[PDB]
Amino acid sequence: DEKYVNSIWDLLKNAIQEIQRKNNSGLSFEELYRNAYTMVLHKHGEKLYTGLREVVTEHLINKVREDVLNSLNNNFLQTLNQAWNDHQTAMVMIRDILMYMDRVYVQQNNVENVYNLGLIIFRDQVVRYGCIRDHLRQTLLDMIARERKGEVVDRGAIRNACQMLMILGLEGRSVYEEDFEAPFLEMSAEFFQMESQKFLAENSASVYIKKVEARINEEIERVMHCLDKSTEEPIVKVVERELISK
Amino acid sequence: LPQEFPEVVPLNIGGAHFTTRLSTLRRYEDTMLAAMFSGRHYIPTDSEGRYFIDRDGTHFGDVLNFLRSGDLPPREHVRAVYKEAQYYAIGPLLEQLENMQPLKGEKVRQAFLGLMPYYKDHLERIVEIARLRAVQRKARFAKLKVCVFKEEVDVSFGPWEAVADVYDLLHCLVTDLSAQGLTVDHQCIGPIYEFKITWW
Amino acid sequence: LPQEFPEVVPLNIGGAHFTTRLSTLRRYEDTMLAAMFSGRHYIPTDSEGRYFIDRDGTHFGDVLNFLRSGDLPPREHVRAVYKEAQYYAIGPLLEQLENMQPLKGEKVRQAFLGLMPYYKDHLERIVEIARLRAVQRKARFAKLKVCVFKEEVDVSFGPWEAVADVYDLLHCLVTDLSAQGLTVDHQCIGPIYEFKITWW
Amino acid sequence: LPQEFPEVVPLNIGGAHFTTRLSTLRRYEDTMLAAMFSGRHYIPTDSEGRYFIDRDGTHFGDVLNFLRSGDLPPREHVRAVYKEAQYYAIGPLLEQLENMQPLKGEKVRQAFLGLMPYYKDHLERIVEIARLRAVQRKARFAKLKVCVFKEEVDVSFGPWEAVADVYDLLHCLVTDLSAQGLTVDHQCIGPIYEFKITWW
Amino acid sequence: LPQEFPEVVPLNIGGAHFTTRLSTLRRYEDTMLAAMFSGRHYIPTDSEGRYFIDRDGTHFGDVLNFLRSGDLPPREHVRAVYKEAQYYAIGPLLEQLENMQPLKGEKVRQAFLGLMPYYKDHLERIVEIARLRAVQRKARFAKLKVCVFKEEVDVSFGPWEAVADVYDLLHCLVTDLSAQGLTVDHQCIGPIYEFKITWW
């Protein structure tokens, strides 16, 4: 009983790790699925579940957490996007392996599914760390300022980062908001506060109106290209309030 | 590798040959058959064009029928196709099969027997005690005493809060024991109920 | 493309191997099999010379038998071959199947039950209310009241104009409920009829 | 052209796979199987060397058994193998099957019913008058009057010269109608007999 | 030679085709199938990729089902799958099948009949003595006298120490003889019991 369970658990753990390292699986899908299905039937879902947590934590906290920590200034957005793509693909494959878990085991415990569990682990561990939060906020603010200042950056990369931030939360905008939007809102407010005084001093009434319209159009274009569409309206409203009502 | 599957998929289910379209397998996206044939996983062939699944194929026909259209199995195949759908993780098939009679009454009675998570353990204790007594004493029948109360005994079934009476539990015991093949007779010895099981 | 078919057509019906002549398939011009094998559509083969139809092939033998000669199923496969003929749109087969007994009495009774288009919904309501009461109360049986009048109740069957009596509809209710596997007993509580369904 | 056949003849009977020797098929010279395999006709091969016969192969095993030895089908398969032997024009098989019980009693009763060539037409007429009455009135049962005499009536059975009485014809009516799946009761209303057929 | 086996093993069990993964066959280390497919023995193929085992494959499906997962056969297939498990030396399957009813009661009664190792020999002596008497005298039934004592006779069942009474052994005699197809009636002629076996 227990010895066979341990053997096929070693098998499943090797398969999960070997998937996480992006190589062709030695075994087949059906064998691993049968192993997981038998584990769940015999009410050994606790040990498989904890082993899945251990392996994903080993691959995130001990691997990609230190990768992003060791790559703060070396393509931070690019390495974050690569880690996000790897996590999504790996969790899709693992969720395919463990569908019977989704059908019963995680549903009597009312916990979120394997893909949702992986999303929550990703957000909690490698989204909510203070160092990576401040670094991503700084990088997003620098990219936004460079776009405003006229410097050309990868808009597709920022769009991918926004998509990752939006999907990091469990079907909610809380993650993207508390991660970037508040720092983005503050940076936009400061920039608009400076620009309002600059345009009032340098430009006449019609010229100031034209400058405010151009700034609003630029903000709308930036939102369309490399930002969330849902949060575009509050940003536009804040920009209009700061530029015009001041 | 992102495999490309033929539109007509030759299937080998534990030595039984089935053939179905690729659209049939991917009909429900959250299913064993859909994830297996989604193309993300490598699928082994078996000396032919057949694709191998290591499970009994006697009742895979009804699973394929439910994938093609809304067809449901007959009565005697409800339980076997339910077992198959559990393996293949076909949620809609599981729901429609649990809405059919052989499993519907079982769910209704599990609503009662779920008040007592020790029911199956106590049943196995009854069977084992009867077998041990019959073998050690070298008899045909073993008589054991059970105590069933709603609010010296070998096996006791404790209190429960429901509208099913004590005599309804004894119906569960005799029916479950008889479903195991045992010949069971129960009598109120005086609340202790004496159970007699005749092995031969 | 104007596909050319061999005179002897190998057939693969959901993994079941059949062989028949082209004239047999094209025997009735207005049919799935005739239109499929009319040469106006491209038909996919399955790793062999056989042509593939993603359908259950257990009762395709009787369909082929009817196409060859005016043969009919032997009174146990009337309903299954009726489903097959419905799928294949074989009109004469449907007519001679509806003139056979298992479906003939069903059409005769549907003549009466056609006066009430809400009948099946009311059976589903009866079963669901009984199941909900049994599960919530944790009982073996659920008793519900129905009101049947020809000219506080859970389910009511309204007026109808026919020569069938009130007791004939209760026969339809009990037989249909028993055809679902339920154990049903009805009593005239006083016109309100109390129905008791025993789940276990 | 004179076709040459292998000594071991591979056979495909409507998708069913059989194998037999050429001597077995040519055992009776005046037969479908002998004339087909006499070599004077061209027989198609179905892409795998088999020789194709567009006919149901379920009971061709008993035909091959009678061609090999004098073996006769079991009691249940008498009628189906009789139908097969009629198609294959195997005379001795037809004789020995008509000499076996399911067909022997039927021949004996057709000796009586041969005096009345309108018997089957009148049975049908009974069935559709009952069906139209039940459908039009929307009833469960249809009552129709029949007049049976040895020497306002819906169906009349005329005179006959035999030793079977009037009540023996009524046995033929009820048994034949019951064999059709109908539920039939009769009584002497006063000689006019009232037949009641219950559809449901 | 150390033979390399494919991960998907095709199997030929006495003309019956099964396909299973290599992991399924090697699931239990101490079995026929594990030793056969361990790689220390040369396994013969049969004109294909199939691996040949010279035994009946009707109930090998249940053996494969148990090897894949702990699935037990239905009650009617307990004995045949038990014989298969004895041949393949699958110990866990033997245990689970000996804890199922068709064999559990047999073990319980063998606990009693194990006190008399001459039981089956005496049953045989009864059967051929009755047969010899019936054939020699040319009768339909043969009457023989047996002596059963717990503490001039053809067959005698000696003393035993158990709680089963004399009449319980007579139940073993009649049931075992009836299980052989014989029609057996016993009467206490006066302890000498007279058994009448009716051959026709």
UniProtKB/Swiss-Prot annotation, chain A:
PTM characteristics: Neddylated. Attachment of NEDD8 is required for the E3 ubiquitin-protein ligase activity of the BCR complex. Deneddylated via its interaction with the COP9 signalosome (CSN) complex.
Additional remarks: High-glucose conditions in renal tubular epithelial cells lead to up-regulation of CUL3 expression, significant increase in CUL3-mediated ubiquitination of MRPL12 and dysregulation of mitochondrial biosynthesis.
Domain of life: Eukaryota
Task performed by this protein: Core component of multiple cullin-RING-based BCR (BTB-CUL3-RBX1) E3 ubiquitin-protein ligase complexes which mediate the ubiquitination and subsequent proteasomal degradation of target proteins. BCR complexes and ARIH1 collaborate in tandem to mediate ubiquitination of target proteins. As a scaffold protein may contribute to catalysis through positioning of the substrate and the ubiquitin-conjugating enzyme.
Subcellular location, record wording: Nucleus; Golgi apparatus; Cell projection, Cilium, Flagellum; Cytoplasm, Cytoskeleton, Spindle
Disease / disorder: Pseudohypoaldosteronism 2E: An autosomal dominant disorder characterized by severe hypertension, hyperkalemia, hyperchloremia, hyperchloremic metabolic acidosis, and correction of physiologic abnormalities by thiazide diuretics. Neurodevelopmental disorder with or without autism or seizures: An autosomal dominant disorder manifesting in infancy and characterized by global developmental delay, variably impaired intellectual development, and speech delay. Some patients have seizures, others have autistic features or behavioral abnormalities. Additional variable features include cardiac defects, failure to thrive, or brain imaging anomalies.
Family named by the database record: Belongs to the cullin family.
Complex formation: Forms neddylation-dependent homodimers. Component of multiple BCR (BTB-CUL3-RBX1) E3 ubiquitin-protein ligase complexes formed of CUL3, RBX1 and a variable BTB domain-containing protein acting as both, adapter to cullin and substrate recognition subunit. The BCR complex may be active as a heterodimeric complex, in which NEDD8, covalently attached to one CUL3 molecule, binds to the C-terminus of a second CUL3 molecule. Interacts with RBX1, RNF7, CYCE and TIP120A/CAND1. Part of the BCR(SPOP) containing SPOP, and of BCR containing homodimeric SPOPL or the heterodimer formed by SPOP and SPOPL.
Protein name per Swiss-Prot or TrEMBL: Cullin-3
Tissue-by-tissue expression: Brain, spermatozoa, and testis (at protein level). Widely expressed.
From Swiss-Prot, chains B, C, D, E:
UniProt domain BTB: residue ranges: 9-97
Tissue specificity comment: High expression in brain, particularly in post-mitotic neurons. Expressed in the mitral cells of the olfactory bulbs, the hippocampus, the deep layers of the cerebral cortex and Purkinje cells of the cerebellum. Not detected in astrocytes or microglial cells. Also expressed in heart, liver, spleen and kidney.
Signal peptide stretch: none
GO biological process: intracellular glutamate homeostasis; intracellular potassium ion homeostasis; membrane hyperpolarization; positive regulation of transporter activity; protein homooligomerization
GO cellular component, one term: plasma membrane
Key words of the record: Cell membrane, Cytoplasm, Membrane
Broad class of where this protein is predominantly found: membrane
Compartments in which it is found: Cell membrane; Cytoplasm, Cytosol
Biological role stated in the UniProt entry: May be involved in the control of excitability of cortical neurons.
Subunit and interaction comment: Interacts with CUL3.
Name of this chain's protein: BTB/POZ domain-containing protein KCTD7
Gene (name only): Kctd7
Region of the whole protein represented: 45 to 289 of 289
